[PDB]
């Protein structure tokens, strides 16, 4: 049947406990819809049991903020009450960028795995979601993710549901949009959207980008980031690497309105800021406002012009539907929270 697993907010990422082997060792894996290789070895050593089997391949993945390489194995993986015999996983001998986690739970589309194995550079690696579905365990090939805002350093306030949605995690109804035809966003959980600030200020004209649980910030193309900095009055900040607003500019901060699937999603002023009681986690000072809208580092028109990251998904329920090749979004009871 469908099944869920709790997920823990670590401010920059979410993790889930994942068992590997029989008997299972638990690893804390980063929930990533922006990549598709499940791997471990960034902290705990890989504990090899009788369900571990070698493959003929090494594995390597390069990310925006890090990388890993190692050797590919098959093993039994457990997610809550769901078990996947013979899940292909990576085991890192090298990794950078993974402080705070054992590795990644790769729930991006399987096409991202092509090229990661050597010498089999054209071979794909079915994901945990794909295997749960093809083995008959979940009734449709889908993952739905609940994130929520946080005021603690580590809060188990999230959920992954494989094979169904959980109506206790969203309000109103889910809006779907097809995966975009525009490359390279089309290789990820890529959608088309536009962004405006307040009632009258365009930020990002309709274009392609991705929805990524494993990107912290809500990133927008550089030309759109300049428009956002102008519209908010924000300035760069040393100590954080985030934009900063004064007290007055936060009081005047308007919503960002995302148009997706013909519907408006409102990322409020409070949703645009880092949780202020946790400002020291990003090098900031207390009673200061830092923004979670960041610069993607590329101009619009490249076919991947935004990343709706963890900070966006703390305010919206998301549905990653492989069977239908679509992405769904809904409001939640926390969309209008003021806890940051």
């Amino acid at each position: 049947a469908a099944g869920s697993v709790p997920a823990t907010n670590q401010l920059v990422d979410y993790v889930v406990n994942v068992g590997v082997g029989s008997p299972a060792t638990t690893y804390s894996l980063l929930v990533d819809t922006g990549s598709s290789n499940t791997w471990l070895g960034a902290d705990k050593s890989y504990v090899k049991t009788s369900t571990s089997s070698a493959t003929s391949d090494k594995v390597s993945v390069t990310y925006g903020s890090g990388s890993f390489s190692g050797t590919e194995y098959t093993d039994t993986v457990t997610l809550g009450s769901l078990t996947i015999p013979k899940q292909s996983i990576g085991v890192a001998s090298r990794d950078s960028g993974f402080d705070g986690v054992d590795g990644i739970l790769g729930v991006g589309p399987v096409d991202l795995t092509v090229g990661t194995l050597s010498p089999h550079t054209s071979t794909s690696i079915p994901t945990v979601t794909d295997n749960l579905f093809s083995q008959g365990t979940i009734p449709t090939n889908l993952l739905a993710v609940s994130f929520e805002p946080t005021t603690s350093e580590s809060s188990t306030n999230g959920e992954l549901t494989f094979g169904a949605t959980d109506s206790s995690k969203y309000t109103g109804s889910i809006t779907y949009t097809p995966i975009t035809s525009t490359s390279p966003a089309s290789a990820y959980w890529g959608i088309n959207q536009s962004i405006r600030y307040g009632s009258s200020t365009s930020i990002l004209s309709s274009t392609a980008g991705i929805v990524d649980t494993g990107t912290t910030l809500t990133l927008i193309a550089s030309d759109a980031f300049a428009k956002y900095k102008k519209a908010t009055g924000a300035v760069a900040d040393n100590n954080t690497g985030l934009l900063r607003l004064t007290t007055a500019q936060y009081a005047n901060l308007q919503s960002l309105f995302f148009t997706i699937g013909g519907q408006t999603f409102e990322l409020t002023a409070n949703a645009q800021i880092w949780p202020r009681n946790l400002n020291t986690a990003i090098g900031g000072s207390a009673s200061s406002v830092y923004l979670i809208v960041g610069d993607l580092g590329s101009d619009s028109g490249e076919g991947l012009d935004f990343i709706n990251g963890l900070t966006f998904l703390e305010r919206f329920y998301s549905v990653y539907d492989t069977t239908n090749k679509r992405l769904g979004l809904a409001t939640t009871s926390f969309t209008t929270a003021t806890s940051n």
């Binding site: 980063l30 290789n37 390069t62 990310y63």
Partner: peptide, 6 residues
């Protein structure tokens, strides 16, 4: 933060 497989 992080930016996960550009």
């Amino acid at each position: 933060x992080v930016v996960x497989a550009x």
